[PDB]
Amino acid sequence: GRHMVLLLDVTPLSLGIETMGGVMTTLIAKNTTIPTKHSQVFSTAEDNQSAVTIHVLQGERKRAADNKSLGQFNLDGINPAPRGMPQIEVTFDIDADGILHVSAKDKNSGKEQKITIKASSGLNEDEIQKMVRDAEANAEADRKFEELVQTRNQGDHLLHSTRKQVEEAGDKLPADDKTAIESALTALETALKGEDKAAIEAKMQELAQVSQKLMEIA
Hints:
By secondary structure, the chain is α+β, with helices and mostly antiparallel strands. It folds into two domains: 1-139, Substrate Binding Domain Of DNAk, Chain A, domain 1 (Sandwich), CATH 2.60.34.10; 140-218, Substrate Binding Domain Of Dnak, Chain:A, Domain 2 (Up-down Bundle). It has five helices and eight strands; from the N terminus they run E-E-E-E-E-E-E-E-H-H-H-H-H. It has helices at residues 125-137, 139-169, 175-193, 197-210, 212-216, and strands at 15-19, 23-28, 36-42, 52-58, 68-75, 88-94, 100-106, 112-116. Strand 6 and strand 7 (100-106) form a beta hairpin. Helix 2 (139-169) packs antiparallel against helix 3. The longest helix has 31 residues, at 139-169. The chain starts with 14 loop residues before the first strand and ends with a helix. It is classed as chaperone.
């Protein structure tokens, strides 16, 4: 006699934001009961990045471009920090009437920004059904896209962190070790423009071994 029951009203399609590489990252999945609130923290892609764009998306596809744009806003005033260090908390709050309120808050600066999403910005009933069918028909292509973007984003961050370490080492890194590292950086860069996630993983691995020489001067 202590059971918990689901409410009846749910979201018709997943809701989320665009993340690096043109991916839709879901915050509230399709079929979640309403009201619901979900927050998740994201970071920046460049050192000392001063603003982020929260681009609100509706749909089941993995490329951001294949989902419906519900709205967008910027949060600026992010204080200087290395890429990946700021903490930007994005909150999706859906009330019992099904209205989506999105806000973002920078945990260091305390700055916030928000938008109220219009029901009329969402997909109509025919478009909801088409979206579910198109996502199902394109499941594999969307999975390959997401996994390639994830691998490319990991490879691009490794290029960046390694380049910073070479600069920080400066004269302490011998010229021949610098050359070998720089050869592995270009190789990884070449892999990153292709569509073979496993090839990128290989070149990441080869950069990691030659970046021994940076470790060796720790």
